[PDB]
């Protein structure tokens, strides 16, 4: 499908995830039949050429997906800004016959890449004029096609929801903050944490929202006049009302209303002078730029590298240079100069003190997170004091994020003047009573904890519905917020279907999907799946290290997830697994033979290892012991085989930064929707929710949040296998199988 | 066994590991029959009293062993320095009837504790004089017994080889450095890393030795005059000869010869000015003081807390106040003022510019590590150029530390002028040839990698001994350094026993024990066990979180280790497991019933969970499925049961800081012993090693290193079960069973 | 003796391809009037492809056409009372072994004491192709597999061709 060349380089500030992008670009370009060249040291080696350019095979990008930084350098170059350096770069690409180029890096590197494209013809004309190349070569390679990848932890680029490497930078930040909180709480100390982000407050905002920071400095929303007094009032209020520690986040580009930089040293000196609290200041530094890439960064970098190869091979000289980005939760493709110009316009608006215009230019998601953070940081005194009463349940298996969602929902409801209850042990508790009212401080510190503080059970309500109705009426509960997995969806569906027989069940209900398996209908991501993929990825990386030490070995790894093969699929992409057997992709004995012979062929190469994943219920008969025996027998003499069963390690320890924020956002938004419906269905002195629109599942669809009615989802649900009919992530299996030889 | 009270507090700078110490002190004091009181906020709450003192039960210190910092505060106090505050403290203890006190903290807190003891009688006399207490109470509580625990990351206290919390501080430091190395290598940047350590260079030295830092600043060995030129020469040499990055460690108390502090900013400005390298500076800050405690800190804190309770209950008023410390690898007990005075004398000698006297006062281990670091940092030009030739093998299963030991041994041998070979795939390789000569740069960057770069196999030599002898003679190999597990010991024993039949096997041999199971005879710790305990501890902590979320659940976790129950025992101590079934402790069906009924009793309390560990070969019949069925059946209605099998995740990812340093030290020391014997057995123009003293196992005994002959160990080895007869760690099982109800 | 469609045996090594070939023959036979099947498996014919393995393979690749079950003939195969042949065969071997024993025992008697040291004094009575023979125990050592506990060459491997022929 190709008879042309690809070049790839990384430039600008490195970010952990570039290695996965280089691997995917290389292996997709080889799969399509194109020659791939690795260009070392970025634009410096592009200009210098020679040994800096070398052809890559399938094994050149092997054993790098789990590594941070980049294996091909990404040094900075000054000569490429000049036309002399650019013609030398064009000459080097022509000498190696490279007509396509992939650039991984921030706005500056992509700007230089398009300037290189925009005059490629004139550079070839000059090279022909001086006699470096012949006319036939100039006519053959007369054009240059560019595809851009945005690798940066800052996440400032406008056309992309997530730049390659920002999720892992959040992982490094939260590792640091989780370390600080122990000693800060121990000694009752304030801390000023300086986070990177060149002129952007994304990292600071997300980390503050995930850590429950007591104050935040971001350049997009500079603090108002006399902010020192308001800071001192808040910090005095927290440390007075039971908050043992205070955390202050401050971006490295934070400013006042006059655009003047606010230093972390100033913040320290202010809190000492005006409150006397013992305090410290930590600059996290270049820890954010390194470490292993998180699971989402590897999956995204692989998807974007594949898409970039498709763009380079399907582009034409009339087509403008493009970047590959996120919109919603899919791999869209945008033109490079539009995104470069929009980012520059945002920066100029922020520089011109038009902070409202800069905020409206970036997107409203930042403002919504900023308002959610301010809402949940401190207790605003409520005034509504509605007669409404709520209960919050955990149902299903525990997931990392339940505690974050419960904290968010409880505090939002207390802010709205409701009496909030929490149920211990789910529907089983609500049958057995076990209902207690909860306050603002009763849920403090839950954001950073995995598992379930309330307790969760798989029990469903129809067997104890008389007791459930009794407790609903005793406590006067007017709405339920059931955060959990498929069992939560089933339970709310049973309560809705029993509304005719029982009048007290005429009650508003919302379901927050929270399970590792990602099997609840009505959402793309369930709260807790990201933590589980990261845990499984870490375990499988250790297994690959064990296998590579004991050369000529293959591993069969069993993942959790029921009949849903999401967790095995994305894990296998994240760790370069040679196969992932899944219920949604039926496989017979012939496919197992075909995989065994590929493993035999791979054992002839330098990479003498293997790893195949198996969902815990992908096949009735061909279990993990079956695959062990088959692989051991047909691979006798070539390799040996071992099995691993990742049990409840896949539920993970502490939640990732995404699960913390995702749970917090879902708790707020579900509570807002709950309050709106609850005041809508109030008539003639009593609540009466009977329409199917009053029982819904909050979930993040392809674009944004939606509240699908629980009964409407019934026609798109598999109650036998406990998962939806149609799942968005089946497209990723083609990339998984492609990246494996 | 007791009718008296215990008080416990944490003071000074907190360190991750204090929580395990408080748990062990509390649970041992309750086990012995004493009342235990938790004293909050350290000496501040001791003076203040009232709510700061409260009686603790078995559940007060539950679910804290995996937490950093301390749950009881440890604030600083100024009033306790005055006699008015000390009499108030004595009055509070008398009001609660406390006559014993445990203090966890550095030198200052322990100094204040003994001053409190030294005048307890006079404080009671003053309290009686003012009428606060009666004469009978003063006569009953007339004395105060003190036991001290040294909690500090600095590791400056003289009487202790490891202070509580320093291993975990190294874990935090190496997490940071492992993050930095990716971006530093990517961009070719120098880095200046400022580590804590008040006036001590232990943290900086160990971290530099574990990270392969290119330069180190410690106060114990200040740099000589004109050190700037020597620094520039070294850093220019590294970055010229293939070392893509440079790392500079600098303690926060580093100084010059004139005692004047050297700032990290100065080091940055110097490298910029004199070399032009792009560079950065990172202050790690209070990240070192927090995070989860490592496995060794939990085990040590538990041992020291137990021993402190024994000291408090077996002490008498003539007995001086004591501290519990490390000597060798056992829990010794020393008098408090001797250690306080020795630490002050070291600090005074270092302040008086008597750096040699301060070095000789601390101990020679620091100097040996300092010389090992300087030896291995850069290549000193050799001059001996002996005719000797070496080979280095990996045998057994891969362990985290093999790569560190190989790097250390290779570079030491190249420094001694030997021609060094490395064998790929162990004895199987040496039979199949696969021998290559290795240089200084050929082993660069291996220090931070787990697994095995050379490759390891379980093959033993007697089946291919003709081919092994052939390759030994072809390459002229005059010594072997076989780093591996029990299979390495077996193989070297077979080569020694075959010396009569084959003359070329008259060759010097050394065995570096490297395996997760800790089953090689002749050592207390095998290289790679610490990484495996940490990995298993992390996995079991996640399992306990899953179990606590799903209330009323018990887990059966299967650990690796063959017939050796070390890994299960120390893991179970580190994660508070209710039982650990081990081959060395035979158990029948009655013991399983007894454990099941204890689990039933524990399920009545607030902690409704359970965790029992099972070594993979502790019982022929009662396998893990057997225990699952038994626990599920006899606990029906009270709890449910699940099983986990920690497979090759227990081999771990990257090695811990201890495994890196331990492997590096063993590689140097084994190579030194190898060179000494090799020049000893050289006579009449040929090497001829035939005595049993020429084939040995390097290992860390109770005190220090020893080289036991391989044949002498045969009478203390179990070749059926592959482990020694007598093992030092069977004493820890009593502590394990005690800490579990 | 029972017309089994297959008998998996250590002396006839079989891989996954042979199991597929037998499964498709079973599928073809299920189209006829005789809708049944029976495959035998020696207890140690394969290290990996155990009886549970064959169960799972046959159940999966024959899904919709037939189902599968497993049986383990344990120590029922040691039988109850002996057959008429075993009674007579044991009786004859006891007589003949005793006759040979008495002959050698009076042969090796010399100077007032028994002294049997030649390898011919330790033998195995057995019915060879034609008639009885007394092979010395040490002479048989070069024709014995002490790992698998059986002789090198066995006369009954010819019967496997008839077994496979009588099955379609
Ligand atoms: N306008 C430009 N023209 C040519 N090259 C450019 C231009 N802008 C940036 N570059 C090149 O991009 C490289 C690094 O980009 P830089 O902006 O410094 O970092 P980042 O990728 O994070 O934005 C530089 O080496 C430079 O040669
Ligand atoms: N926890 C916080 N962190 C950072 N900024 C905050 C925080 N809380 C409030 N602010 C900002 O300080 C100002 C005062 O807070 P505000 O929400 O306006 O209180 P009010 O309800 O009186 O209007 C606002 O501009 C707000 O954005
Ligand atoms: N760790 C992650 N796992 C899965 N998807 C993610 C992750 N991080 C970001 N995303 C996706 O990119 C988007 C970035 O989220 P963000 O813009 O910060 O806030 P919001 O989700 O409210 O719009 C997310 O909506 C999500 O679709
Ligand atoms: N000589 C002393 N007399 C009485 N109390 C002391 C003395 N030295 C230290 N303390 C007490 O020890 C507490 C903290 O000890 P400090 O030296 O500051 O930290 P560290 O434990 O790390 O050495 C202080 O609150 C102080 O009251
Ligand atoms: N990698 C290093 N890090 C820190 N100090 C070093 C390092 N290498 C050498 N030094 C110190 O700098 C001085 C010069 O190095 P040295 O080992 O004495 O070289 P030489 O072989 O010429 O004597 C010594 O005091 C040494 O302790
Ligand atoms: N992570 C660990 N695991 C097991 N034992 C340890 C660990 N760390 C320290 N120790 C023990 O405490 C001692 C501290 O070692 P150190 O004094 O720094 O150097 P050396 O081992 O050469 O004497 C070690 O010898 C060891 O016995
Ligand atoms: O499939 P769900 O209900 O969404 O939850 C997933 C969890 O359920 C499990 O089946 C575990 O079940 P148990 O906790 O009852 O043993 C795993 O697939 C996984 O840990
Ligand atoms: O017992 P050793 O040889 O010291 O190493 C321990 C490892 O060896 C093992 O036996 C694993 O063996 P395999 O890798 O061959 O499956 C486990 O007990 C454990 O993972
Ligand atoms: O390593 P450098 O050159 O100091 O880069 C610092 C910048 O890196 C970034 O991550 C983007 O390159 C920014 O956050 C930061 O300002
Ligand atoms: O948090 P503080 O008070 O600044 O303590 C700093 C000191 O803590 C320590 O870890 C010991 O208390 C030292 O390393 C450091 O100098």
Does A517 contact chain B (CB < 8 Å)?
no
Helices then strands (H, E): number in chain A?
23, 26
CA dihedral angle for residue B673, residue B674, residue B677, residue B683, rounded to 10 degrees: -160
Does C59 contact chain A (CB < 8 Å)?
yes
- Axis-axis angle for helices B166-187, B295-314 (nearest 10): 160
* CA proximity to B601, closest of B635, B572, B625, B651: B635
Does B52 contact chain A (CB < 8 Å)?
no
Specify the DSSP class assigned to residue B292. Answer: P
How close C48 gets to chain A, by Cα (Å)? 5
Distance CA B199, CA B222 (A): 12
Hey, what are A446's tokens?
């839950």
Cα distances from A465 to residues A454, A497, B602, in angstroms, run 21, 12, 31
Cα distances from A143 to residues A85, A99, A117, A138, A338, in angstroms, run 18, 7, 8, 9, 21
Specify the DSSP class assigned to residue B691. Answer: S
Helix (H) or strand (E) run with residue B391 in it: strand B389-395
Contact by Cβ (8 Å): B390, B413: yes
Specify the DSSP class assigned to residue B692. Answer: G
CB of A662 closer than 6 angstroms to any ligand 3 atom: no
Distance CA B19, CA A72 (A): 45
Helix (H) or strand (E) run with residue B429 in it: helix B426-431
Question: DSSP string covering B615-679, please?
Answer: ETTS-SS--HHHHHHHHHHHTTTT-EEEEEE--GGGG-SSPPHHHHHHHHHHHHHHHHHHHHHHH
Q: List the domain range (segments joined by +) for residue B276.
A: 166-289
CA of B606 to the centre of ligand 6 (A): 38
What SS3 class is residue C11? Answer: coil
Distance CA B377, CA C139 (A): 68
Instruction: Give C53's contacts in chain A (Cβ within 8 Å).
Output: 626, 629-630
User: Which residues is C135 bridged to in the sheet?
Assistant: C124
Contact by Cβ (8 Å): B163, B15: yes
Distance CA A414, CA A420 (A): 7
Backbone conformation region of residue A159, classed left if phi is above 0, alpha if psi is from -120 to 50, else beta: alpha
How close A541 gets to chain C, by Cα (Å)? 28
Question: DSSP string covering A534-578, please?
Answer: HHHHHHHHHHHHHHHHSSSEEEEEEE--TT--HHHHHHHHHTT-S
Distance CA B124, CA B122 (A): 5
Among protein residues, the one whose CA lies closest to atom 11 of ligand 9: A13
Specify the DSSP class assigned to residue B13. Answer: S
Q: Strands B723-724, B640-645: parallel, antiparallel or unpaired by DSSP?
A: unpaired
Distance CA A427, CA A482 (A): 9
Hey, what are B573's tokens?
């101590």
- At residue A390, φ and ψ (nearest 5 deg) are -125, 155
User: Which residues is B697 bridged to in the sheet?
Assistant: B511, B708
C77 is in an annotated binding site: yes
- Experimental method reported for this structure: cryo-EM
C113 is in an annotated binding site: no
Block residue for tokens 């001694």: B416
Block residue for tokens 């807790």: A528
Give the HSE-up count for residue C13: Cα atoms under 13 Å, Cβ half-sphere: 5
Q: Which of A621, A623, A633 sits opposite C16 (nearest CB)?
A: A633
Specify the DSSP class assigned to residue A728. Answer: G
* CA proximity to B93, closest of B149, B23, B155, B141: B141
B6 alpha-carbon distance from chain centroid:
29
Residues 6 or more apart from A529 whose CB is under 8 A from it?
A: A515, A516, A517, A518, A566, A567
Backbone conformation region of residue A51, classed left if phi is above 0, alpha if psi is from -120 to 50, else beta: alpha
A357 alpha-carbon distance from chain centroid:
28
Instruction: Give B294's contacts in chain A (Cβ within 8 Å).
Output: none
B640 in active site: no
Residues 108-167 of A with CB under 8 A from B: none
Contact by Cβ (8 Å): B111, B105: no
Contact C53 A626 (CB under 8 A): yes
Distance CA B612, CA A119 (A): 70
Question: DSSP string covering A398-446, please?
Answer: --TTHHHHHHHHHHHHHHTT-EEEEETTHHHHHHT--EEE--SGGGTTG
Q: For Cα atoms B687, B690, B694, give the angle at the middle one, nearest 5 degrees.
A: 85
Ligand 8 first shell, C-beta below 6 A: A 550, 642; B 396-397, 485-486, 515-517, 519, 560-562, 648
Hey, what are B540's tokens?
């079991």
- The secondary structure of chain B in percent helix, strand, coil, rounded to multiples of 5, reads 45, 20, 35
Cα distances from B305 to residues B25, B26, B150, B322, B324, in angstroms, run 5, 8, 11, 13, 9
Specify the DSSP class assigned to residue A672. Answer: H
Distance CA A385, CA B259 (A): 66
Does C20 contact chain A (CB < 8 Å)?
yes
Distance CA A151, CA A168 (A): 12
End-to-end CA, chain C: 15
Distance CA A111, CA A337 (A): 8
Helix (H) or strand (E) run with residue B481 in it: strand B479-484
Block residue for tokens 């409520």: A382
Contact by Cβ (8 Å): A192, A303: no
What SS3 class is residue A619? Answer: coil
Distance CA C46, CA C9 (A): 8
Helices then strands (H, E): number in chain B?
23, 26
Distance CA A567, CA A485 (A): 15
CA dihedral angle for residue B246, residue B251, residue B252, residue B253, rounded to 10 degrees: -140
Q: For Cα atoms B443, B449, B452, give the angle at the middle one, nearest 5 degrees.
A: 75
The secondary structure of B77-143, three-state, reads: CCHHHCHHHHHHHHHHHHHCCCCEEEEECCHHHHHHHHHHHHHHHHHHHHHHHCCCCCHHHHHHCCC
Contact by Cβ (8 Å): A11, A105: yes
Contact by Cβ (8 Å): A561, A567: yes
Hey, what are B416's tokens?
């001694």
Judging by beta carbons within 10 Å of its beta carbon (0-12, 13-18, 19+), is residue B92 exposed, middle or buried?
buried
For residues B7-43, b (16+ Cβ closer than 10 Å) or e, as one string? bbbbbbbbbbbbbbbbbbbbbbbbbbebbbbbbbbbb
Contact by Cβ (8 Å): C93, C131: no
How close B321 gets to chain A, by Cα (Å)? 27
Q: Which of B75, B176, B647 sits opposite A287 (nearest CB)?
A: B176
Size of interface A-B (CB pairs under 8 A): 204
CATH number at residue C33: 3.40.50.460
Distance CA B720, CA B724 (A): 10
Question: DSSP string covering A677-690, please?
Answer: HHHHSEETTEE---
CB of A488 closer than 6 angstroms to any ligand 7 atom: no
CA dihedral angle for residue B275, residue B276, residue B278, residue B282, rounded to 10 degrees: 60
The secondary structure of B496-554, three-state, reads: HHCCCCCCCCCCEEEEEECCCCCCCCCCCCCCCHHHHHHHHHHHHHHHHHHHHHCCCEE
Hey, what are A506's tokens?
């005429």
- Axis-axis angle for helices A624-634, A589-602 (nearest 10): 50
Judging by beta carbons within 10 Å of its beta carbon (0-12, 13-18, 19+), is residue B484 exposed, middle or buried?
buried
Distance CA C24, CA A157 (A): 59
End-to-end CA, chain A: 17
Distance CA A378, CA A668 (A): 14
For residues A100-135, b (16+ Cβ closer than 10 Å) or e, as one string? bbbbbbbbebbbbbbebbebbeebbebbeeeebbee
A113 alpha-carbon distance from chain centroid:
28
| Sheet architecture: strand order including B279-283 | B215-217, B246-251, B190-195, B279-283
Residues 6 or more apart from B287 whose CB is under 8 A from it?
A: A176, A179, A180, A282, B172, B176
Q: For Cα atoms A154, A160, A162, give the angle at the middle one, nearest 5 degrees.
A: 55
Does A239 contact chain B (CB < 8 Å)?
no
- At residue A468, φ and ψ (nearest 5 deg) are -65, -45
Which ligand 10 atom lies nearest to the CA of residue B198? 16
CA of B252 to the centre of ligand 2 (A): 38
Distance CA C161, CA C142 (A): 28
- At residue A32, φ and ψ (nearest 5 deg) are -75, -10
Helix (H) or strand (E) run with residue C35 in it: none
Distance CA A353, CA C80 (A): 101
CB of B107 closer than 6 angstroms to any ligand 4 atom: yes
Contact C16 A634 (CB under 8 A): yes
Cα distances from A31 to residues A28, A37, A184, A310, in angstroms, run 5, 14, 52, 11
Instruction: Give C52's contacts in chain A (Cβ within 8 Å).
Output: 625
Chain A residue at shortest CA distance from C53: A626
Question: DSSP string covering B151-190, please?
Answer: B-SS---TT-SS-BTHHHHHHHHHHHHHHHHHHHHHHT-E
Specify the DSSP class assigned to residue A502. Answer: -
Block residue for tokens 């203090």: B103
How many Cβ atoms are within 10 Å of A567's Cβ, its own excluded? 27
Q: Which of A14, A154, A156, A214 is catalytic?
A: A154
Block residue for tokens 């000459």: A91
Contact by Cβ (8 Å): A45, A73: yes
Hey, what are A560's tokens?
């959790």
Q: Which of B14, B154, B214, B425 is catalytic?
A: B154
Hey, what are A250's tokens?
């401050």
- Cα dihedral B613, B615, B618, B622 sign: positive
Contact by Cβ (8 Å): A517, A510: no
* CA proximity to A455, closest of A419, A493, A483, A481: A483
User: Which residues is A481 bridged to in the sheet?
Assistant: A392, A510
A3 alpha-carbon distance from chain centroid:
36
- Axis-axis angle for helices C51-61, A589-602 (nearest 10): 120
* CA proximity to A182, closest of B288, B106, B77: B288
Distance CA C126, CA C144 (A): 15
Contact A621 C56 (CB under 8 A): yes
Hey, what are A128's tokens?
């022909």
B356 alpha-carbon distance from chain centroid:
27
Question: DSSP string covering A24-53, please?
Answer: HHHHHHHHTT-EEEEETTTHHHHHH-GGGE
Cα distances from A567 to residues A545, A582, B499, C59, in angstroms, run 21, 10, 56, 28
Distance CA A197, CA B187 (A): 18
Backbone conformation region of residue A391, classed left if phi is above 0, alpha if psi is from -120 to 50, else beta: beta
Distance CA A531, CA B545 (A): 14
- Cα dihedral A723, A724, A729, A730 sign: positive
Q: What is the resolution of the experimental data for this entry, in Å?
A: 3.0
How close A452 gets to chain B, by Cα (Å)? 5
Specify the DSSP class assigned to residue B283. Answer: E
Question: DSSP string covering B719-731, please?
Answer: TTTTEESS-GGGG
Question: DSSP string covering B242-279, please?
Answer: T---EEEEEETT-B-TTSPBPPHHHHHHHHHHHH---E
What SS3 class is residue A230? Answer: helix
User: Which residues is C133 bridged to in the sheet?
Assistant: C126
Among protein residues, the one whose CA lies closest to atom 11 of ligand 5: B223
Residues 6 or more apart from A649 whose CB is under 8 A from it?
A: A535, A536, A539, B539, B542, B543, B644, B649
Chains contacting B with at least 3 CB pairs below 8 Å? A
Contact by Cβ (8 Å): A710, A509: yes
Chain C residue at shortest CA distance from A632: C48
Q: Which of B74, B183, B547 sits opposite A69 (nearest CB)?
A: B183
Contact by Cβ (8 Å): A448, A654: yes
Block residue for tokens 């927090």: B290
Residues 29-48 of C with CB under 8 A from A: 46-48
What SS3 class is residue A233? Answer: helix
B185 alpha-carbon distance from chain centroid:
29
Contact by Cβ (8 Å): B456, B426: yes
């Amino acid at each position: 499908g190709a008879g042309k060349a690809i070049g790839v380089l990384t430039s600008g500030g490195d970010a952990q995830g570039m290695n996965a992008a280089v691997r995917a670009v290389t292996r997709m370009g080889i799969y399509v039949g194109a020659k791939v060249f690795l260009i070392y040291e970025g634009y410096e080696g592009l200009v210098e050429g020679g040994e800096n350019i070398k052809q890559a095979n399938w094994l050149s990008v092997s054993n790098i997906i789990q590594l941070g930084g980049t294996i091909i350098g990404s040094a900075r170059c000054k000569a490429f800004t000049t036309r002399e350096g650019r013609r030398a770069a064009a000459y080097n690409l022509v000498q190696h016959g490279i007509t396509n180029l992939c650039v991984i890096g921030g706005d500056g590197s992509l700007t230089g890449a398009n300037i290189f494209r925009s005059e490629w013809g004139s550079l070839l004309e000059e090279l022909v004029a001086e006699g470096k190349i012949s006319e036939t070569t100039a006519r053959t390679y007369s054009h240059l096609n560019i595809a851009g990848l945005v690798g940066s932890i800052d996440n400032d680029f406008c056309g992309t929801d997530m730049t390659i490497g920002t999720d892992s930078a959040l992982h490094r930040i939260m590792e640091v903050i989780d370390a600080i909180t122990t000693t800060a709480q121990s000694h009752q100390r304030t801390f000023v944490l300086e986070v990177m982000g060149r002129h952007c407050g994304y990292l600071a905002l997300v980390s503050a929202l995930a850590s429950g920071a007591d104050w935040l400095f971001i350049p997009e929303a500079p603090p108002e006049d006399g902010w020192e007094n308001f800071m001192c009032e808040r910090l005095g209020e927290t440390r007075s009302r039971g908050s043992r520690l205070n955390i202050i986040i401050i971006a490295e580009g934070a400013i006042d209303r006059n655009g003047k930089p606010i230093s972390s040293s100033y913040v320290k000196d202010l809190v000492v002078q005006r409150l006397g609290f013992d305090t410290r200041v930590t600059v996290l530094g270049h820890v954010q730029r390194g470490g292993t890439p998180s699971a989402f960064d590897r999956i995204l970098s692989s998807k974007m590298g594949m898409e970039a190869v498709m763009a380079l091979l399907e582009a034409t000289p009339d087509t403008p240079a493009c970047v590959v980005t996120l919109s919603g939760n899919q791999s869209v493709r945008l033109p490079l100069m539009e995104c470069v110009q929009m980012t520059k316009e945002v920066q100029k608006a922020m520089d011109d003190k038009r902070f409202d215009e800069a905020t409206q230019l970036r997107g409203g998601s930042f403002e919504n997170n900023w308002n959610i953070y301010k809402l949940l940081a401190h207790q605003k005194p409520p005034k509504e004091k509605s007669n409404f009463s709520l209960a919050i349940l955990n149902v299903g298996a525990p997931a990392a994020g339940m505690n974050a969602a419960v904290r968010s929902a409880v505090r939002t409801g207390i802010s709205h003047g409701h009496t909030v209850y929490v149920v211990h042990d789910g529907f089983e508790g609500l049958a057995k009573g076990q209902v207690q009212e909860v306050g603002w401080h009763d849920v403090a510190g839950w954001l950073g904890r995995g598992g379930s503080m309330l307790g969760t059970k798989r029990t469903l309500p129809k067997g104890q519905l008389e007791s459930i109705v009794e407790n609903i009426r005793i406590y006067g509960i007017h709405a339920l917020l059931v955060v959990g997995g498929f069992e939560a969806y089933e339970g709310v569906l049973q309560l809705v279907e029993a509304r005719g027989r029982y009048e007290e069940l005429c009650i508003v209900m919302c379901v927050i999907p929270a399970t590792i398996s990602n099997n609840v209908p009505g959402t793309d991501f369930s709260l807790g799946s990201d933590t589980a993929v990261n845990a499984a990825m870490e375990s499988c990386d250790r297994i690959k290290q064990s296998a590579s030490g004991t050369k000529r070995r293959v591993f069969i790894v069993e993942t959790m997830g029921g009949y849903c093969g999401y967790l095995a699929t994305v894990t296998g992409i994240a760790v370069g697994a040679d196969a992932a057997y899944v219920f949604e992709d039926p496989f017979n004995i012939h496919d197992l033979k075909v995989n065994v012979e590929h493993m035999t062929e791979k054992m002839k190469t330098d990479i003498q290892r293997g790893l195949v994943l198996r969902n815990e219920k992908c096949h009735d008969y061909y279990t993990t012991e079956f695959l062990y025996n088959l692989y051991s027998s047909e691979g006798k003499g070539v390799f040996d085989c071992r099995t691993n069963v990742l049990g409840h390690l896949q539920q993970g320890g502490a939640p990732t930064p995404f699960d913390r924020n995702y749970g917090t956002k879902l708790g707020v938004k579900a509570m807002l929707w709950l309050s709106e419906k609850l005041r809508e269905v109030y008539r003639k002195g009593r609540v009466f929710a009977n329409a199917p629109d009053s029982a819904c599942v909050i979930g993040l669809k392809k674009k944004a949040v939606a509240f699908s009615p629980v009964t409407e989802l019934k026609k798109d649900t598999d109650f036998e296998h406990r998962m939806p009919r149609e799942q968005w992530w089946l497209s990723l299996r083609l990339m998984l199988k492609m990246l494996a030889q």
